[PDB]
């Protein structure tokens with residue numbers, strides 16, 4: 001996260017960290033939505049242009065953290081993935097459409113004051129809240145900033161980062177790009193003419209874009225960090241997955257065994 | 260309207276420097292690589308495991324900053340250079356109907372205007388900033404005993420303990436990974452050890468004392484972690500794993516033999532340990 | 542709106558931070574989101 005800020009330990013319990021087993025390497029952020037389901041950006045697992053296609057074995061998530069460095073026995077719980085769920089109509093060949101994925105933990109975890117789940121946007125809360133102008137919250141351990149020093153990754157913070165970004169209106173979003181947009185994704189950030197700034201960056205993806213409902217002091221994950229051209233550049237905005245609009249799919253896949 | 264601020268300038272490269280004599284393109288593409296190679300290196304000094312502590316932060320931010328302020332420069336350089344490239348590309352088309360050639364994107368475009376005055380100044384700041392870091396550290400260590408690094412002997416002593424204990428858990432792992440009733444909890448153990456232990460090939464260095472302390476307790480706990488979850492009882496003494504004393508593929512005999520003893524350990528072990536565990540489960 | 546038997550537990554309590562919410566503790570940049578909700582009144 002660019003223009004980020006050290007989170008306050010216990011600020012994003014539902015914040016998972018998709019970590020790769022070997023070579024030990026940080027892949028993406030994620031989202032805990034229950035005690036056995038975690039939600040992330042579909043491309044964090046699969047993305048052929050970068051020869052990416054991980055599987056349950058290749059990695060393991062880590063919930064209830066803060067320091068990306070050291071192991072935190074006191075609060076850190078490490079769990080292995082049972083089955084992996086990428087979206088069918090997921091389009092990477094062209095523009096990362098339906099860039100969302102579901103992960104089913106091999107064993108249900110015990111929620112502590114640090115591993116609590118998040119809520120999914122509501123059919124009504126979606127409308128009441130998803131309006132251009134409103135600010136959401138993005139968290140992750142992604143690139144601290146953009147670097148000409150390409151060919152190098154390790155540029156992340158030490159602790160979890162948090163940045164609150166306002167929603168941009170459809171026109172602009174589409175306008176600020178030569179990449180085709182879809183109702184299945186939204187863009188957030190600060191307009192150049194504005195003062196503040198910030199953005200999520202690489203190795204941030206999977207992470208949540210939450211908002212807190214004033215009608216019930218609860219946090220709903222409106223979006224997933226998905227893509228963007230550069231990072232916190234001036235003129236382009238960061239694109240997240242429109243989680244609510246996809247909630248139809250989600251359901252369709254969790255409540256699977258039965259029908 | 261057309262005015263922008265954002266002067267996050269903290270680079271030690273003199274402004275009136277980019278007006279120098281541009282480096283011969285051929286000899287340029289190289290200096291660029293030099294540059295990159297410095298950032299690459301410098302950054303690494305941070306991801307150095309030994310520094311993953313709470314006392315080092317204020318001194319790591321220091322560097323990190325020094326490193327970005329310089330990188331910012333170069334970015335702003337490229338970000339500017341491109342805008343001037345686009346134009347001279349346009350005025351290039353309006354001369355050649357044959358757009359046989361295509362315009363390079365910001366991500367393809369490389370820096371083409373880099374004086375030497377610029378290059379030196381950047382390196383003299385990073386080469387600098389780092390020496391600065393080494394200081395910040397050497398200091399923080401003369402004030403935090405356990406943090407001062409070991410000696411080739413010392414480090415070997417710790418490292419050896421840890422590796423033994425670790426290999427002592429791999430006994431537990433192998434022991435129950437086949438136990439269909441505990442297959443998972445075993446796997447999480449094994450995978451959790453690999454996690455802390457470090458990449459197999461180049462594992463986290465057991466530099467200072469503290470690292471030795473923690474590593475044991477983190478491995479200590481991770482082991483108890485297994486028992487709490489399988490309920491099973493921790494034996495006050497389990498054999499260690501010698502890759503040559505009982506290989507799962509080269510010394511099966513001593514391999515299954517190792518597991519027999521271990522299972523028996525856990526089978527006859529008392530509930531005395533539950534009162535000592537590292538993590539206060541509950 | 543899922544059945545624990547398939548979605549797991551936590552649904553009910555979702556969104557409430559045991560170290561903030563369920564303790565009347567607001568975080569360093571919470572009101573900031575409420576600043577985006579209503580600029581008047």
Ligand SMILES: *C[C@@](*)(O)[C@H](CCCNC(N)=[NH2+])NC(=O)[C@@H]1CCCN1C(=O)[C@H](N)Cc1ccccc1
Nearest residue numbers: 095200201202203204205226227228229230231238
């Ligand atoms: C998966 C991630 O962590 C990462 C998130 C990037 C967020 N960036 C900003 N500026 N907020 N996603 C990516 O890097 C994606 C996946 C692969 C390509 N990519 C990009 O964002 C490119 N920069 C643009 C792009 C290229 C091809 C197809 C879609 C987008």
Ligand SMILES: *[C@H]1O[C@H](CO)[C@@H](O)[C@H](O)[C@H]1NC(C)=O
Nearest residue numbers: 046047048051052053054055
């Ligand atoms: C890897 O995942 C499955 C393995 O069967 C395969 O179908 C898929 O095409 C692969 N992913 C990539 C990189 O295309």
Ligand code: NA
Nearest residue numbers: 189190232233
């Ligand atoms: Na921006």
